[PDB]
């Protein structure tokens, strides 16, 4: 069994996009199919499901009327129409296969008469078991573009003590930080940035120095954001 997703990319919040999943190496027309997203780095979340015949459609409430699953058994392709996107929809979308081989038991014998064809009353239905997965396709929804970092001071806490400066709301990486014009590499710890809900980046760099030198030695946070051509030299005071 082999699943391959495609169609993902970067699209602004509101605009649409269409994800495809090319099925192969199995009888597509027999098994149900699901979509499962996973925001990096958080838990799994099933989006939508569809049965073998396409008579059954399932969706999560957070995607109730903005996402619709669909398939084309002739092309063994699974389609997910993503329109009216949100930032919270940002995730890696996995194409999943249902384990249970579905089969119909009761036919109506009322209409049409082929007249193709007759839908099923009591099919086995999806089992909800995601046995085979793809590597997924990434979907990025962000109302963000190039913006400069708003630098801010930090407090003296007690290593003994510990100072820093906050790099706030910038995009995109990289952002390099140094101290006292690269004279002070030492007792330095630059933490990794963040992935805000609004898609903006922000990091922090703490520094642990002699508490005795505070009143005397002055420490100046050197920030740098080359993409926005912004440099900042923030002087941190107690």
């Amino acid at each position: 069994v082999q699943l391959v997703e495609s169609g993902g990319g970067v699209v602004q919040p509101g605009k649409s996009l269409r994800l495809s999943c090319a099925a192969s190496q199995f009888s597509f027309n027999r098994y149900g199919m699901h979509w499962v997203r996973q925001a990096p780095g958080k838990g799994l979340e099933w989006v939508a499901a569809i049965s073998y015949d396409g008579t059954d459609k399932y969706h999560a409430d957070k995607v109730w009327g903005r996402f619709t699953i669909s398939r084309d058994n002739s092309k063994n392709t699974l389609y997910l129409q993503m329109n009216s996107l949100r930032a919270e929809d940002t995730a890696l979308y996995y194409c999943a296969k249902d384990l249970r081989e579905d089969e119909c038991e009761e036919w109506w014998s009322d209409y049409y008469d082929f007249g193709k064809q007759l839908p099923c009353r009591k099919s086995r239905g999806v089992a909800g078991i995601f046995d085979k997965w793809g590597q997924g396709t990434m979907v990025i929804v962000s109302s963000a573009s190039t913006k400069g970092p708003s630098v801010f001071p930090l407090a003296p806490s007690s290593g003994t003590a510990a100072l820093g400066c906050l790099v706030k709301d910038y995009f995109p990486e990289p952002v390099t930080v140094s101290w006292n014009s690269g004279a002070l590499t030492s007792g330095v710890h630059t933490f990794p940035a963040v992935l805000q809900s609004s898609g903006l980046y922000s990091l922090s760099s703490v520094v642990t120095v002699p508490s005795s030198s505070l009143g005397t030695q002055t420490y100046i946070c050197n920030v740098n954001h080359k993409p926005s051509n912004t440099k900042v030299d923030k002087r941190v005071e107690p």
Binding site: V36, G41, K42, G43, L44, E45, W46, Y58, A60, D61, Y94, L99, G125, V126, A127, G128, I129, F130, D131, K132, W133, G134, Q135, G136, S150, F152, P153, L154, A155, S157, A162, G164, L166, K168, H189, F191, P192, A193, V194, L195, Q196, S197, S202, L203, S204, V206
Partner: protein, 211 residues
């Protein structure tokens, strides 16, 4: 809403226990599916129909079920078992309830643990005048690198405004992560204090600040 333990860890050999939980509506009446997801790779079916394991999966991975819970178990742990473990349920057919568990990270490491040194900072005077607020809780030097930050305001817990980065190895092979509680100035002046609870290997460390 099926909930699982944030983190789990054990040295190579001893047995591990992971449990789900929820109403009898999404536990008792239904079956339990389990899935493994090693780092940087797609998930995989571990156990379906509560007990039955598909081919390729060792007999170590034992499933289970009860009235309002469902437990996964791994006997002998290899470096490969180190992965994320989610549970799932699907019936009958469904409601507005969830589908997958919150997650449970299994870390396989016999090496000695290192407690986290939590460092909390209050917002700046400059920022408050910029009409915004930000609490920075910096977590450094810990191992096996499994944390679970939790913010609280005057005992009461906080939910919205939280953003927590993933742990990351330092130079000394110890992990470090940061958590920001973005806030409005009006919310910041409403409560006496704001706390930062870091939950690493059972033991919790709580720092707190005030204006």
């Amino acid at each position: 809403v099926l909930t699982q333990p944030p983190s789990v860890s054990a040295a190579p050999g001893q047995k591990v226990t992971i449990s789900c939980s929820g109403s009898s509506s999404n536990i008792g009446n239904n079956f339990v599916s389990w899935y493994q997801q090693r780092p940087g790779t797609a998930p995989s079916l571990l156990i379906y129909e509560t007990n039955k394991r598909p081919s390729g999966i060792p007999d170590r991975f034992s499933g289970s079920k009860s009235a309002t819970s469902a437990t996964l178990a791994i006997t002998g742990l290899q470096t490969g078992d180190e992965a994320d473990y989610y549970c799932a349920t699907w019936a009958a057919s469904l409601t507005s309830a969830r589908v997958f568990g919150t997650g449970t990270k299994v870390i396989v490491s016999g090496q000695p643990k290192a407690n986290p040194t939590v460092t909390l900072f209050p917002p700046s005077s400059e920022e408050l005048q910029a009409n915004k607020a930000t609490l920075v809780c910096l977590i450094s030097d810990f191992y096996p690198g499994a944390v679970t930050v939790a913010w609280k305001a005057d005992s009461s817990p906080v939910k919205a405004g939280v953003e927590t980065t993933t742990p990351s190895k330092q130079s000394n092979n110890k992990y470090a992560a940061s958590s920001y509680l973005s806030l409005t100035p009006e919310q910041w002046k409403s409560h006496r204090s704001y706390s930062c609870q870091v939950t690493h290997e059972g033991s919790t460390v709580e720092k707190t600040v005030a204006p």
